[PDB]
Paper text:
Addition of Ala797Pro on the SWC template ([name] mutant) generates a archetypal Na+/K+ pump. A close-up view shows that the [name] mutant binds three Na+ ions in E1, and two K+ ions in E2, like the NKA. Due to the weak densities at sites I and II, the Na+ at site III is the only one unambiguously determined, while it is difficult to discriminate the other two Na+ from bound water molecules. The densities were interpreted by considering optimal water-cation distances, hydrogen bonds, electrostatic repulsion, and the need for multiple oxygens surrounding a cation. This results in a close overlap between the Na+ modeled in our structure with those in the NKA crystal structure (offset, respectively, by 0.5, 1.6, and 0.3 Å for sites I, II, and III). We found that TM5 pivots at site III, where the Na+ located on the extracellular side of Tyr790 is coordinated by side-chain oxygens from Thr793 (2.3 Å), Ser794 (3.7 Å), Asp827 (3.3 Å), Gln942 (2.5 Å), and Asp945 (3.5 Å) and by the main-chain carboxyl groups Tyr790 (2.8 Å) and Thr791 (4.2 Å), nearly identical to its coordination in NKA8. Coordination by the main-chain carbonyls of Tyr790 and Thr791 breaks the alpha-helical hydrogen-bond network of TM5. Therefore, we propose that in addition to providing a mechanism for Na+ selectivity at site III by the size restriction as previously proposed, the straightening of TM5 is essential for the allosteric conformational change of the whole enzyme structure required for phosphorylation. Interestingly, our Na+-bound E1 structure of the [name] mutant has a water-filled cavity that reaches Asp945 and is capped by the α-subunit C-terminal tyrosine residues in the intracellular side.
Here we study primary-active transport via P-type ATPases using functional and structural analyses to demonstrate that four simultaneous residue substitutions transform the non-gastric H+/K+ pump, a strict H+-dependent electroneutral P-type [name], into a bona fide Na+-dependent electrogenic Na+/K+ pump. P-type 2C ATPases are obligatory heterodimers formed by a catalytic α subunit and a auxiliary β subunit. While the [name] is electrogenic, generating an electric current as it extrudes three Na+ and imports two K+ per ATP hydrolyzed (black ions), the gHKA and ngHKA export H+ and import K+ in an electroneutral fashion (cyan ions). The exquisite ion selectivity and stoichiometry characteristics of these pumps are determined by their ion-binding sites, formed between transmembrane helixes TM4-TM8 of the catalytic subunit.
Residue numbers in the entry:
A (entry chain A): 52 to 1036
B (entry chain B): 28 to 304
The structure:
């Protein structure tokens, strides 16, 4: 189905759709069309049912190992029950494993579902806006309210809301990556070019953004009717991205699974060698795998992401990918844009320069006419230039509120100039109506000026008035004369000196300065009927007449200086990349803190020492202000050197390509960069940067689409908060891994001691499994709720290759300190139980062979008493239960010490994390249920314990806590020392 | 680099030395609570188990009287255990005391204290285990086909068995029961067919009584009473059906004596005997 009006001319557009080219459809027509057509929303594709995600969560992570272990246990139970009654313990163990894996899967599914609903809901209230024109007036309405046939005007930075047939394009360039695949600038022309709808340039097919210029189109298709809706490929949604923290976690789980496989193989071989039953050795194998692998780690990372997404949501932000937080937390360079991000983006004219004099003005609540006289010819010409070259228009239907309250859909500088012209002179609309305009070049970053062609209605009918405004330096360089006292004269050094000193005076206050000029084209060169071509030079662009300058107040945000101070405290290099002149950029940077106090550039050093600029060495300057042209003519090696040897960098008069070069160089320095931008000029930098940041209000649709994060509050402190959340995620994951790795040794060591020293089995398969499933699931999740420490933002950014999530020092600590101490406590309680029942520690050496010999029912203990085989196996069960309780209490101590890495427990707080106490209470409950249930009827190698056996390992837990606190205190007191370097994980 | 390797190895040396010191200190502090004379608890051992001497693997006695090697292991085990009950090893008088051959009330030799040193022990004579002592008949009754098993009660430190009172006789009533100083032990067939085909059973104890005399109690624990000789009971099954898997259960009756379904050797035990032809 391909039926479009691509070949059909513009004449049939009015008749077919019944809408005017300019005025458009009426409000009454829109009301009836809304109830008949419907909203402009694409059909949400069916990704997967909830049951599929739910089953995937029960088969996600390490749950396959638990399922296989339960299946093998049930098979062993069936095999042993086929022969005789056997024992009803494998079925109960398998039931417990199934219950725990189901519970873990349910919790993970609930957490990921909550995170998904939060992210979708907080990414869905953002509305797409369309600049529609109705009754010769423009009102901003949501894209869902768009209908078929209306006229839509789209300029650079705003996504095209629907399938529009272009009827007026002025050098407009669009990106057809979603349509064709290329991101190159595709020019747009009103004239019908290609028979195929896709190839012709007279129609845009939705899901595309205009790179620059302006375009006027007529809607043909809406919703699924357009080409992007016709094709099944997703315009937006799930992209292609794999966060490095996922790579780190996956590598860690792979290596721990491999080591666990080696361990289970070696223990299975030893157990078969020691004449165990095959099924018993297989269950022991399964317990070895289950205990060693870090089950619940994926649940922990899911919990961390689901919490931090909401935490940034509290700060009124939008995050497209759940794991962009991790990349943000490792950001080392922040490439910010001054205008629209650091400042209020609200500006008012305050100072004016013409006739070699600076004129002040009232910032707000003037209530009176301007101080300077309006009768002067120079000021009249300046006002005419302001009125003509400007394209901004007040919001229709709002001519009752003050001037500042009236909104404009044009450029902010154009808006302010329009407001100034309206408050100082008459209606700008009447002036533009009188001054007929034939062609006009919209402002673009490459040109750095706005070009217009107007028909002159003055008695001196030149009929071609070329009026330009833009960068004062380029305009002055393009001007060979300046009008003073209303008379043209060649440019002299006195005028240049006055202009320069006035410009320094204006820039010292951090104000923005604009230049305005005009020129009358000769009548001989161009007749009344002349054809103007954009490619053709035609009218000269040089030898214009300079007039003067206008100053613009751009106040900054209140909280931005604190955010900059925090970022520089965290080791993040803030780089200001703006298109403003170096003087104002440097003044603003000094005011806010991008350039620190007492920090000076080469020009400041030369001025204060009164020496030649070249004579000054580059090393003494800690800050630099680089112009756009110098960076443009700068080789990559020179740029790398500049970024390496300088602390604070401010870029001025920059282009989008220059921003891309800066971003790629900063990437080449092996640094993670976050780039903030709002305009269409920022799109390449937003895409190339590791983290993309766009403004919620001042940002454009293209910037929002390209950014990886959106600031709906438009504050710099949001970046600081995001970096803090990423750092907290890294710290919490490290803490959880450190806690998890501790219990591996207390499980493996008793079997080694049993094999080597010959002691009766200190711990069984069931006890190891229960330690795993009661001590290393809930507390690991609970450590994901831990808050950030006080030193979180006083640390240097982590290098991608230098700093890794699971370093060798973490494994060394977790295995050789806490694991060994926990094993020692468990063995202490084991020896206490055996000695109190009648077997001294020395008598237990090499007692294994006689202990499990069913033949010997009169084993002689240390007091000479004879023990029945069942009695000493009950003693073995009691020892195993005491070992379990000791390990659990020492795991309480380990959980307490694993919630911090630098600060003490007194600084952090004992009861700040309630989920820690939830896990501790859960362990208390499971210990009681294991010792007093199933111990009153001894089934799973568990028996009732005396009261004193619960408190034997408490001193060892206190010792663990004291040792860890002493280590942290010595790290804090002596930073950078041998202890700090080797004892910090 | 050795400069930092030495320092980290030194830290590990002191760290592990301190860990070992704490472990050893905690073990020693626990051990000061442990008495060398009397165990802290007797939860697992207080009801003594009842076992036999032949020390058979799977609770089975399988032997053919024609082939000596069938019962060679059983006879060797019995004589090896009975080596210490020979009157040659009981000739000493400083530690062995000759208490009467008639059962009497349990004798208290004092509280469990290091004072008074080693205690004296009654001497148990092999001639009381007639027909199965090996003095009159070497290799016991395995040649003829009349197997002997010697029944002993597991040693429990400071344990005084209480035989059942005269008013309540759970075992078989007897004129010669003499309950004040004899702990009754009776061997019966496990089930109906085994009861039918068990044959005659005769018991050899001190003075012709069936069970354990009470003056051999309490045991004082290998440190106050080394070379202690617990009372023995000999059971000979005389004539039993040949080529038959006969199961015999021996049970000890008393107030302190208790039984459990989980522990099959607590206060009783099971033996399976089949004399091959
Ligand atoms: N509406 C307008 N009319 C005339 N000249 C303009 C203009 N907007 C910008 N200019 C001129 O163009 C030059 C280039 O500035 P540019 O617009 O690239 O900076 P920028 O504001 O886009 C950086 P950012 O978008 O990140 O805040 C400036 O020196 C300015 O004088
Ligand atoms: C047991 O001893 C009696 C004499 O006390 C003897 O007559 C009898 O033959 C013996 N029985 C066996 C089987 O040795
Ligand atoms: Na585990
Ligand atoms: Na642990
Ligand atoms: Na573990």
């Amino acid at each position: 189905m391909d039926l479009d009006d691509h070949r059909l001319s513009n004449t049939e557009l009015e008749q077919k759709y019944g809408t005017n080219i300019i005025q458009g459809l009426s409000s009454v027509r829109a009301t009836e069309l809304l109830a008949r057509d419907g909203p402009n929303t694409l059909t949400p594709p069916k990704q997967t049912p909830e049951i599929i995600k739910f089953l995937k969560q029960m088969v996600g992570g390490f749950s396959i190992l638990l399922w296989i272990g339960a299946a093998l246990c049930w098979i062993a139970f069936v095999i042993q029950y086929v022969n005789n009654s056997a024992s009803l313990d494998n079925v109960y163990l398998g039931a417990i494993l199934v219950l725990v894996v189901i519970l873990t899967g349910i919790f993970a599914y609930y957490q990921e579902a909550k995170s998904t609903n939060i992210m979708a809901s907080f990414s869905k209230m953002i509305p797409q806006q369309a600049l529609v024109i109705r009754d010769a007036e423009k009102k901003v309405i949501s894209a869902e309210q768009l209908v078929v046939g209306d006229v839509v005007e789209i300029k650079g930075g705003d996504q095209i809301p629907a399938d529009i047939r272009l009827v007026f394009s002025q050098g407009c360039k669009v990106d057809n990556s979603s349509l064709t695949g290329e991101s190159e600038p595709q020019a747009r022309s009103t004239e019908f070019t290609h028979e195929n709808p896709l190839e012709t340039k007279n129609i845009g097919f939705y899901s595309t953004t205009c790179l620059e210029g302006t375009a006027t189109g007529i809607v043909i298709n809406t919703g699924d009717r357009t080409i992007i809706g016709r094709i099944a490929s997703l315009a937006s949604g799930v992209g292609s991205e794999k966060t490095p923290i996922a790579i780190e976690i996956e590598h860690f789980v792979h290596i721990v699974a491999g080591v666990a496989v080696s361990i289970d193989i070696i223990f299975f071989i030893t157990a078969v060698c020691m004449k165990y039953y095959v099924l018993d050795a297989i269950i022991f194998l399964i317990s070895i795998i289950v205990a060693n692998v870090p089950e619940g780690l994926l649940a922990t990372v899911t919990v961390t992401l689901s919490l931090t997404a909401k935490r940034m949501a509290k700060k009124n932000c939008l995050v497209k990918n759940l794991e962009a937080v991790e990349t943000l937390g490792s950001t080392s360079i922040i490439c910010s844009d001054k205008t629209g991000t650091l400042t209020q983006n609200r500006m008012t004219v305050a100072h004016l320069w013409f006739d070699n004099q600076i004129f002040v003005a009232d910032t707000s609540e003037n209530q009176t006419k301007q101080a300077f006289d309006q009768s002067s010819g120079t000021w009249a010409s300046l006002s005419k230039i302001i009125t003509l070259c400007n394209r901004a228009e007040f919001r229709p239907g709002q001519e009752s509120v003050p001037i500042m309250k009236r909104t404009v859909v044009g450029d902010a500088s154009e808006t302010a100039l329009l407001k100034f012209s309206e408050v100082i002179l008459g209606d700008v609309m009447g002036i533009r109506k009188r001054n007929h305009k034939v062609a006009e070049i919209p402002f673009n970053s490459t040109n750095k000026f706005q070009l217009s062609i107007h028909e002159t209605e003055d008695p001196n009918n030149k009929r071609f008035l070329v009026v330009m405004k833009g960068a004062p330096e380029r305009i002055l360089e393009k001007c060979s004369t300046i009008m003073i006292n209303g008379q043209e004269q060649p440019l002299d050094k006195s005028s240049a000196d006055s202009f320069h000193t006035a410009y320094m005076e204006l820039g010292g206050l951090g104000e923005r300065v604009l230049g305005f000029c005009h020129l009358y084209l000769p009548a001989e060169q161009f007749p009344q009927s002349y054809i103007f071509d954009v490619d053709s030079v035609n009218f000269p662009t040089s030898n214009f007449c300079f007039v003067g300058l206008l100053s613009m107040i751009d106040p900054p945000r209140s909280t931005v200086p604190d955010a900059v101070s925090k970022c520089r405290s965290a080791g993040i290099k803030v780089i200001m990349v703006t298109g403003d002149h170096p003087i104002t950029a440097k003044a603003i940077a000094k005011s806010v803190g991008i350039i620190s106090a007492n920090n000076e550039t080469v020009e400041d050093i030369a001025k204060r020492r009164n020496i030649a600029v070249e004579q000054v060495n580059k090393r003494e300057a800690k800050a630099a202000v680089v112009t756009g042209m110098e960076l443009k003519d700068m080789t990559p090696e020179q740029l790398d050197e500049l970024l390496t040897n300088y602390q604070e960098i401010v870029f001025a008069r920059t282009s989008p390509q220059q921003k891309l070069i800066i971003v790629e160089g900063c990437q080449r320095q092996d640094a993670i960069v976050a780039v903030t931008g709002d305009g269409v000029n920022d799109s390449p930098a937003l895409k190339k940067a590791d983290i993309g940041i766009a403004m919620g209000i001042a940002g454009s649709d293209a910037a929002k689409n390209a950014a990886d994060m959106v600031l709906l509050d438009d504050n710099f402190a949001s970046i600081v908060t995001g970096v803090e959340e990423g750092r907290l995620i890294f710290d919490n994951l490290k803490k959880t891994i450190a806690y998890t790795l501790t219990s591996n040794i207390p499980e493996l060591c008793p079997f080694l001691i049993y094999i080597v020293a010959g002691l009766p089995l200190p711990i069984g398969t069931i006890t190891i499994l229960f330690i795993d499933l009661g001590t290393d699931i809930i507390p690991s999740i609970a450590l994901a709720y831990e808050k950030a420490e006080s030193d979180i933002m006083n640390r240097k950014p982590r290098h991608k290759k230098k700093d890794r999530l699971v370093n060798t020092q973490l494994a060394i600590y977790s295995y050789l300190h806490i694991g060994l101490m926990q094993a020692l406590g468990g063995f202490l309680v084991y020896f206490t139980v055996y000695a109190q029942q009648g077997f001294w520690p020395t008598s237990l050496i090499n007692l294994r062979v006689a202990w499990e010999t069913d033949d010997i029912n009169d084993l002689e203990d240390s007091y000479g008493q004879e023990w029945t085989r069942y009695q000493r196996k009950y003693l073995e069960w009691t020892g195993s239960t005491a070992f379990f309780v000791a390990i659990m209490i020492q795991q309480w101590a380990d959980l307490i010490i694993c919630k911090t890495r630098r600060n003490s427990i007194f600084q952090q707080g004992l009861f700040r994390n309630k989920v820690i106490w939830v896990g501790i209470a859960s362990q208390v409950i499971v210990a009681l249920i294991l010792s007093y249930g199933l111990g009153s009827v001894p089934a799973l190698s568990f028996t009732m314990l005396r009261v004193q056996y619960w408190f034997v390992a408490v001193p060892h837990a206190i010792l663990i806590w004291v040792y860890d606190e002493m280590r942290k205190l010595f790290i804090r007191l002596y930073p950078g020392s041998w202890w700090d370097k080797n004892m910090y994980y | 680099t050795g400069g930092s390797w030495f320092k980290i190895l030194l830290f590990y040396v002191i760290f592990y030395g301190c860990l070992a010191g704490i472990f050893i200190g905690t073990i020693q502090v626990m051990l000061l609570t442990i008495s060398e004379l009397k165990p802290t608890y007797q939860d697992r051992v207080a009801p003594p188990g009842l076992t036999q001497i032949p020390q058979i693997q799977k609770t089975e006695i399988s032997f053919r009287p024609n082939d000596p090697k069938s019962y060679e292991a059983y006879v060797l085990n019995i004589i090896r255990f009975l080596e210490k009950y020979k009157d040659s090893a009981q000739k000493d008088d400083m530690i062995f005391e000759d208490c009467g051959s008639m059962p009497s009330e349990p004798k208290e030799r004092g509280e469990f204290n290091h004072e008074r040193g080693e205690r004296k022990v009654c001497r148990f004579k092999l001639d009381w285990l007639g027909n199965c002592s090996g003095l009159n008949d070497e290799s016991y009754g395995y040649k003829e086909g009349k197997p002997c098993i010697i029944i002993k009660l597991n040693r429990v430190l400071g344990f005084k068995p209480k035989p059942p009172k005269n008013e309540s006789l759970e075992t078989y009533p007897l004129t010669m029961k003499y309950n004040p100083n004899v702990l009754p032990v009776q061997c019966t067939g496990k089930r109906d067919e085994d009861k039918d085909k068990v044959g005659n059973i005769e018991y050899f104890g001190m003075g012709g009584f069936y069970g354990f005399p009470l003056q051999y109690y309490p045991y004082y624990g290998k440190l106050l009473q080394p070379k202690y000789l617990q009372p023995l009971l000999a059971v000979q099954f005389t004539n039993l059906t040949l080529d038959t898997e006969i199961r015999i259960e021996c049970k000890a009756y008393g107030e302190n004596i208790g039984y459990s379904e989980k522990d099959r050797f607590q206060g009783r035990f099971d033996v399976k005997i089949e004399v091959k032809s």
